[model samples]
Target: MQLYSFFNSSTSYRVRIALALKGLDYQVVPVALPTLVDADGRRFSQSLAIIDYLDAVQPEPRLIPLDPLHRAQALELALLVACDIHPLNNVRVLKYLTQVLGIDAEDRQRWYAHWVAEGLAAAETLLNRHRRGAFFAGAAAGIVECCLVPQLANARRMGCDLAPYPALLELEGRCLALEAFQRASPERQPDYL
Candidate 1:
């Protein structure tokens, strides 16, 4: 597979984690977007879509839970980050906030902190109530972990305070220690600044 996600994009990073966990080797391509060209020669874009595609094809070491309730639990947290927090903090959004809106750096960072904390706080409560094992997916990393770790990296990069969220901190710690996550992390990526 040829993967194209040429940034320190959290969406892109999650796809990388999913691929690495499945032990799938893919060629990284230069693109300003996230894409995956599979052995079937079908092109896939959208990080979560690519993740579901991988899970559907590979099956083993399931990234998402097969049980209905468990699946709901996973998607809740994943979308909580993917839809709510991520949309506001991506480069284009930030660029607009800076270039068009004239929101200065400190004020823009304030905006970033507010959204990240609001979403992260919600996630912390949700996890404290619903989390089972080491990760939201259970004893090992799974789909929710795939999303959370990357967004949390974005959060940290923007100077958001994480001390209030113990659950997230624990989750981040465990995910980072795992080899798949370590290898897929932004700092380890070739395009990472």
Candidate 2:
């Protein structure tokens, strides 16, 4: 199988973690965002669609839980990251902010921080009630943690003050310590130089 992944694309990174956790081997073809291209013969552009494709093909690691309640919780966390936080800071969106919208770098930083902190804070609140086992669903520890870690990384990269959410920070620590998460990090990926 092939994965069209950029080293720092959080969505691709999430899928990377999931693939590793399931012991699946796939060719990593880099998709360069600056070029506005998916030249790696990628199956799709939407991250969720890629994940659904994975689930359809493998269905073993099971990113989403089988139970309805847990599944909803999982989807909630995933959507909070994928739908809410991601688009605001996506490569194209960020580029548009600076190139077309005439936003200054500092203002763009603010833009990124605002959305990221909001999404993570909302995630923290939801996790407060439903989170278990250092993960969103409290069991799988795959997708939700995968989502949080990269977004948190992005937040930190943009100098977002994350002091308000201790639990989310702690959870990110726990997830980072795991082999699956570690192996799939941006620095470890082939595209990172």
Question: What's the lDDT for all of these models?
Answer: 0.85, 0.76
My TM-score estimates for the predictions, one after another, are 0.94, 0.88
Q: Supply candidate 1's per-residue lDDT for 28.
A: 61
Worst 10 residues of 2 by lDDT: 32-41
Model 1 lDDT per residue over 110-172, tens place: 999999989999999988988868888788788898889988888998999999998899889
Best by TM-score: 1
**For candidate 2, what's the RMSD?**
3.4
In model 2, what is the error at residue 36, expressed in angstroms?
17
Tens digit of per-residue lDDT, candidate 2, span 1-193:
6677788887788777776767663545576321112345444556565565667667987877777888788788888998999888987898898899899989999889989878888988987878756567665675677678888888898899999888889888888888888877889877789
Clashing pairs in 2: 132-138
